Amino acid sequence: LNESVLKVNELNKTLSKKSTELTEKEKEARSTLDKSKQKYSLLIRDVEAIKTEMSNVQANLD
């Protein structure tokens, strides 16, 4: 039980890192869209990838 508690407390740091990368990718994608079509699509793919990793971390934490 102690080891599991440590594992989730550390899985919070990955949730935090991918929060950071998601913010950066979302900024890039929205900047591309506001101004480009292909770059916007690719950047949205990256945004979805980071958010997917976040959702994975959230399910594991849950």
Question: Can you tell me the distance from the alpha carbon of 20 to that of 55, in angstroms, rounded to the nearest whole number?
Answer: 14
| Number of C-beta neighbours around residue 5 at 10 A | 9
Tokens of residue 34, six digits: 């506001």
Resolution (A): 3.6
How far, CA to CA in Å, does 1 sit from each of 4, 6, 8, 49, 59? Answer: 5, 9, 11, 31, 18
How far, CA to CA in Å, does 34 sit from each of 4, 27, 59? Answer: 44, 11, 33
